[PDB]
């Protein structure tokens, strides 16, 4: 199907505790494959997936040099941002960036992404046209003006339509036995009496990849969206994900409830019931 690659940057200032920390992680779909941390004893861009390890030393030298340059740029940007918001130099602040590209089954660019947040708030984003910016406030308008004069949008378009998709295609071929394998959820329903009056039906999906999944309870064929407790999809630690959805049902009415599961790895969507 479709695939994405994303880099996630976080820069955190910490006055009185050294210079701002810079962390970068790269993902293909839901698989992390590199990390950089400026706080590591010997900061360098490091592998986190087996299929990236075949890249040669020129690869790792380049990625490390980019991360070190980005560390310095992000430190300067944090200083600039503090000034744009008239903030004290005693406070901690966060600058986040996430960028990358989405490709379709044929490897063609679906769209590119580049957006930024300051203290958890959207700050500036490259528009889908890859040629203009949406600035959140008057501070981000200063950044927009700087980037308009530095021809930033043009450089992002060249990267997102060129290098980004070419490397994603390369990663997808090198990691094809995992990146291009969907693992379906193992599913089942558990039953947890609450009282004489009610019990919890809990529908489980385990061991699936990628993380995108739809898990819904119906009562008499009608979705129970307002009455379903749905936990956030969570990593198992072994590449795969877990999720459950629960409804509180009247005792003796369990068979009126069905759990419906949709996932890319399933030949056909599943319908499950409590099976006592």
């Amino acid at each position: 199907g479709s695939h994405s690659m994303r880099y996630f940057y976080t820069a955190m200032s910490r006055p009185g505790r050294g210079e701002p920390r810079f962390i970068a992680v790269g993902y293909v779909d839901d698989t992390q494959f590199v990390r950089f941390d400026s706080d590591a004893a010997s900061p360098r861009m490091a592998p986190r997936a087996p299929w990236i390890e075949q890249e040669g030393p020129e690869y790792w030298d380049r990625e490390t040099q980019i991360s070190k340059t980005n560390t310095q740029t992000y430190r300067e940007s944090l200083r600039n941002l503090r000034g744009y918001y008239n903030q004290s130099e005693a406070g901690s602040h966060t600058l986040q960036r996430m960028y990358g590209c989405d490709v379709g089954p044929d490897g063609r660019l679906l769209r590119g992404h580049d957006q930024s947040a300051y203290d958890g708030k959207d700050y500036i984003a490259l528009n889908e046209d890859l040629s203009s910016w949406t600035a959140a406030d008057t501070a981000a308008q200063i950044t927009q003006r700087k980037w308009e004069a530095a021809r930033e949008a043009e450089q992002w378009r060249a990267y997102l339509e060129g290098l980004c998709v070419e490397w994603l295609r390369r990663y997808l071929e090198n990691g094809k036995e995992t990146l291009q394998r969907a693992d379906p959820p193992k599913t089942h329903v558990t039953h947890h009496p609450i009282s004489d009056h009610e019990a919890t039906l809990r529908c489980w999906a385990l061991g699936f990849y990628p993380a995108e999944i739809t898990l819904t309870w119906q009562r008499d064929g009608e979705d129970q969206t307002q009455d379903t407790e749905l936990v956030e999809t969570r990593p198992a630690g072994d590449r795969t994900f877990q999720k459950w959805a629960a409804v509180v049902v009247p005792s003796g009415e369990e068979q009126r409830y069905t759990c419906h599961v949709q996932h890319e790895g399933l030949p056909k969507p599943l319908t499950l019931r409590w099976e006592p």
Partner: peptide, 9 residues
């Protein structure tokens, strides 16, 4: 493959 980011905010 990362982008080289050299334009400050």
């Amino acid at each position: 493959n990362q982008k080289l980011i050299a334009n400050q905010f």
